[model samples]
Target chain A: LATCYGPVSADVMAKAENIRLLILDVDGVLSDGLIYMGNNGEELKAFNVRDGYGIRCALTSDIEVAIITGRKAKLVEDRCATLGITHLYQGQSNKLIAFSDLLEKLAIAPENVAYVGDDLIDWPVMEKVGLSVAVADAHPLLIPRADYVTRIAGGRGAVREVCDLLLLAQGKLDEAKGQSI
Target chain B: LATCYGPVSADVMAKAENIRLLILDVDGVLSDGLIYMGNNGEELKAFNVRDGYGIRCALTSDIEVAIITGRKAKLVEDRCATLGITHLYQGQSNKLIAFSDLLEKLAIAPENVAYVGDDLIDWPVMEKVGLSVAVADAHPLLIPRADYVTRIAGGRGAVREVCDLLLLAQGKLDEAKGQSI
Candidate 1:
């Protein structure tokens, strides 16, 4: 049988197949784990184009995408708008609360949600999500708790890699890859 | 510049680049987190091919790989032998002691080693390692404590994913992939 790049178990595949909502942590998972400060005291972050494409692909396939980050940045806002992600929450130190609010608003169960994070702040929600993922360079503390960790780091193609995994598990990867259903 | 799939920070890249030894937890991180028993009281496990390939890759690159687990399995011994991973420790309730012994024997500092685990049992060593990783489908409690998490589950390609990260960070991934100096 044709499979993804890595060796994945049927059990892990099942978990990904059940995901209806996908949540992301911005700084470390969506952007490279760096905070760039301009001389004008403005914060800037470099996002991965492939990661954005992954978000768009997931959205196109009816998979809901949301963002929760500790730092409030205008770039994030613009990026979310560009990607058409409606459920965006920023500057949240307590990410679980934001996660809960999103779940309640969407009326989705925790088991139907997948969270991708790369740092300690992403812990509480990652623990609660159905499938928790960490980036390649995520904090050591987060890895043991995650259901999966991407081969890529944040602000690279980590999000895209995850999108491919989720889509593949759900039998939507071909469709998302521009193959006709 | 061409880079790996994800955008890892300089700090995380530095951590991976400096890794002299990589340790693994057998059951959940290297195996499928399942144990099958035969009528004769024998334990069996199905190992992932990609994980083995990863171990070989790391070893070929001169990066030492070790196994430390709470369980004792003959299959683990056989598997480690095939991969040429010599630092094997099993049947330890307190893994830190084994970790320290390995560190002492190798003359490697904790900050120069990377450990991968999947449960609470692996906590102490994870805390002490320079980079602590968790497998996908790891215990939720382990997530907050890991430095990185794999997108693939145990006995799957989690090991390969980690090995690739280490090689990439050290600018040795291509060499490892090609098997040429």
Candidate 2:
């Protein structure tokens, strides 16, 4: 349903005042939908560095970040290792169960978390999360259910925008905007 | 390994003469090693709009554009689609192999190809390409091996700088600079 300030519920609005965890999906949600092939069978993917920094910013804010995807690749693992992401679950066919497992592992209640996804697989988690977001190019079917729609598409800063908003809702806008921190 | 132009094999120069493909890697080679992650787990990747327009310039010059990356995600895919890049490979572990596969698929010789990358993983392909470019913040190991070094970092427009160079080398610089096709 539509809310006044944004798409989050009042209770979520309250917990957002002190949000602790942020979960995301890969594929259409983190990278634009293109894959590149090299001569040696190496697949290359371009990622927005701004998104990396956004995760760093969230860490600075004491907010935890996690990634979940159905795909498996060495590059994906390497990226997470490079970024120091802690709550990662890959190669899962069932995202709904993954979501539940994530909450349990983090010792967080669903009301204290935020989720971002762009396609149908995201629907189940989106319906259950405290805050749900859809990227600009998200499937048309999923858009209506999102608590907020990012101006940026997935992998192009959709996650960063969500970080900024969550921080803002928690009265941490100035801190997130400040570069020195 | 280092051939001084004009004084070296004339056949080598001939091989470089009909260049047609331009491949790029995103991340440190594009942006300045900064990533932004949102509370919703979406990522924010900033690309120089000018760099994006450079792809159009290459298309106008009949130079095919492609992106080879190791991270597979829909965000990367989405951005390429927006950029009109039909050849994209994400989540590639062996970029060198993928590079060769692309050459075979396109029927283009390695000498007719130009590649740009920024990290250690890029070394294998960079070592074998007709033109090997490294971005400003590229690892020290890569910098020494590059045929050319970009003033801009990855995700910031280094690829665009390389694009300009390729066009110049092909004597199509003036045509690319011109507004009309």
Candidate 3:
């Protein structure tokens, strides 16, 4: 996409090409690794607009997006609806079940799912996916175990980086560009 | 402070050293220049967590933050509260008056204020502040008029860059770091 692969292996790019489902971890992957508490006790988490735009692009390209989080939030659900992401498995204590459920529902193979996260809980699901990615600021223990790590840190447009890679690897960047993403 | 000021002049650094109040614009400066309308007609705008984190750091250092925007939204108000930014002047059809209002309320001189925005409405406030910044993806017309342009784009942690500069200039980073900001 950028004339060459930077900070990533060619094999990773090859794997991205086969990705049909992108599994996301809500906390660190979509938001920075912090939780904000409102004066009224409402929970607040910030999502990058760039990442939202990229997810839309990925969706239009027939690459489905799913969120597998250990915690639950109404805001996350609303955000998923806004982004047109229909596959969200929240409050999953065991993401392996969510992964398998998504696999069964979407009929997508494990090799077609690319799961990305920043912590060790995500590591287990990563082990089963074809492409297991960790954000740049992921737990140190998870990075070395990942198939590939992102150049950008979590909650800082890191998801968009993956979206761009998938689009470029699958030759859908032009169509995404036409849609102004 | 990063040794050797890159992409900016000594004069700009001098201005940042005097900054007491940081003024912000909502739409493009905080969100990546896009309005996402929900299915139920609810408007969605994504904010950067890193920016919110920096605003907290700046607040703790007594570098007051303010949000002066042309539009008014409950979500924006909630975000301001989350970041501990109390000086919010929303729905300002004329930002120049709001800028003056903040200058008077805070009892600070024009030379002690720094304002950043992405469009022409912000340019007028920029002309009146000590340090004026434009995000990387700002309207081209506004970038040339800025005292300094950020390396990062709007809604992509550009606000954090300004927060870091003010903290470093005012010699409050160590204090902020002590608080784990």
Candidate 4:
């Protein structure tokens, strides 16, 4: 019954067409930033499987995906593995270094990347990418600098909004629709 | 910067105060109702970890949590175990029957329970609970009949809204805040 936020704006459409890779931040961006615990006191993090499906959509469409976060956890690794994402940069103290390593290793250009973040740690990479996206409930500071803001909040199908955006912009949406997941 | 839709209305607050049991649906409520698949073609569903945490909040406050859905899946069972939820009624073609048995077995009055759903299957029980909540993106038909409509959409922190609502109305929010996870 619902649709992706809306059609992409001209400016956003132009930038998105050039993207070859989509990078994301965890925590607030993918899991609503809440840490719950199990009966055994194991820390549990929330993740929206729809976002994982979004990652799949991008991959099947030939757009690469990466995860760069400041924490190192088995769950994060397991999630990436589940999504078939191998370029995960976990336990990053300074996200830029990971960003640098990611681009250099893949031979992807700065203007060919899209980075989505909810807070400041993502700014260094976001400011340098071809397209920078902030979730609907992202930090106010991040919003002003974002090339486009998502209608959906992170960890709540916001990533799918961006995934669908790229697909629509690159004309891959129709074929990609219900391709899998 | 954001709040739970808003403060509970007088009528809603009154209904919520008696919620000794919080019943939830699986798809479109605990999750965004989007199904993805793993590399092996196994079916996957998205769930908000914050919703898991919200379940934690309610259970800790002595408000029993139960899961009643139309489908039965190991993932759903696994999730309930993670959150320590023991009242799960899955695979009920006619949900009202499960609803009937749930209350009878628990000895919990229907008026002392709250039901949250996003689609029509939830209707049978929603119509009977003390408090019936619909997510922001719920079926429009279900909205007008709801006791309260959440600001957050399903699988996107909507459960947390209700969790906090019960916590607040029952005079348990402050202590429940940051209690564990």
Per-residue lDDT tens digits for candidate 1, residues A50-161, read 8877888899887999998888878888988888899999889988888879878999999999999888778788778788888888877666457776767777888888
Question: What C-alpha lDDT does candidate 3 achieve relative to the native structure?
Answer: 0.79
B1-181 in candidate 3: lDDT tens per residue? 2622245567777889999899998777888755443323355677888788888888878788898876667988888777777889876767889888888788999889998887656776898888999998765446878888998888888988888888777777666741222
Alpha-carbon lDDT, every model: 0.81, 0.69, 0.79, 0.79
Lowest lDDT block of 10, candidate 2 chain A: A172-181
The lowest-lDDT stretch of 10 consecutive residues in candidate 2 chain B is B1-10
Worst lDDT run of 10 residues, candidate 1 chain B, spans: B1-10
All candidates in order of DockQ, best leading: 2, 3, 4, 1
Question: Residue B26: error of model 1 in Å?
Answer: 16
lDDT of 3 by residue, A95-137 (tens): 9998989988999999999988999899889999988999999
What TM-score is obtained for chain B in each of the predicted models? Answer: 0.92, 0.84, 0.92, 0.92
lDDT of model 4, residue B45: 67
**CA-based DockQ, model 1:** 0.04
Per-residue lDDT of candidate 2, residues A1-181 (tens digit): 2222245556545645656888888777667756655565656555555466466668778888888887766666666765678778889878877888887887888867788888888888888777887888999999989877776677765666677667767766555521110
Docking class of 2: incorrect
Better of 2 and 4 by TM-score: 4
lDDT of 4 by residue, B97-158 (tens): 87788789889899998999999878889999999999889999998889999988887778
Winning candidate number (TM-score): 3
**Over 4 Å off in model 2, which ranges?**
A1-15, A38-40, A177-181, B1-181
Comparing 1 with 3 on TM-score, the higher-scoring candidate is 3
